[PDB]
């Protein structure tokens with residue numbers, strides 16, 4: 001289609017702000033479609049060494065074609081700015097709901113965990129590691145299905161070299177894997193560690209390694225220093241114990257543990273119909 005331009009849209013509210021990008025709601029005049037348009041100022045990204053992250057985001061998003069990921073529809077630029085036209089996920093961050101409700105019941109924990117697992121199966125199947133999986137990066141569309149975002153710190157592993165490990169130091173302290181801290185590399189299984197932290201957070205209300213500053217969190221991660229509250233659903237506790245494993249080759253779902261089949265077969269997921277989750281009606285949070 002014809003390359004789009006800023007004057008093709010009516011821009012509305014800011015949806016999200018980052019250190020070097022802003023996401024604005026926009027309506028395309030010719031179609032009345034709403035998009036979340038991520039806008040980056042060229043001068044700022046150029047001066048602040050952020051171009052590689054922008055190019056990474058574009059390259060990774062261009063490869064994805066799955067209901068549980070934000071879609072990149074179009075890109076364009078003008079003299080000052082770069083624009084990425086993205087899916088609009090009207091209900092915003094999963095984190096908002098955790099904070100408001102406190103924690104999720106078992107049905108809701110299972111459904112949303114299953115969507116995230118299905119998403120990771122797809123991503124890992126394409127040889128891509130997210131590296132910054134967390135509730136702030138898991139958006140909810142109008143129908144309350146997930147849409148994972150934030151691919152500027154993702155990595156396409158090279159199929160040509162059978163690459164398994166990546167060397168860039170990226171992530172968020174609460175969710176970062178022990179291997180990144182200790183061995184200075186991440187792998188697909190690093191996202192499974194983040195998953196285990198997320199499941200824990202949905203049930204407990206807080207992620208498992210927490211402190212008022214990053215170094216203290218790191219110290220806890222490397223020692224596997226965390227505990228479960230009372231009434232933590234037993235099969236979810238079992239699952240989290242199978243994900244929060246220091247040895248990245250021993251996490252349920254990882255390649256050395258024979259992949260997603262055994263993870264999807266975990267007793268916590270007994271009821272789950274995996275093949276068409278995005279067409280199922282999500283359970284109500286309240």
Ligand SMILES: O=C1c2ccccc2-c2n[nH]c3cccc1c23
Nearest residue numbers: 015016023036086087088089092
């Ligand atoms: O931060 C948001 C965001 C925040 C609130 C509501 C919707 C969105 C939203 N919809 N699509 C995208 C793509 C990237 C980021 C964001 C979105």
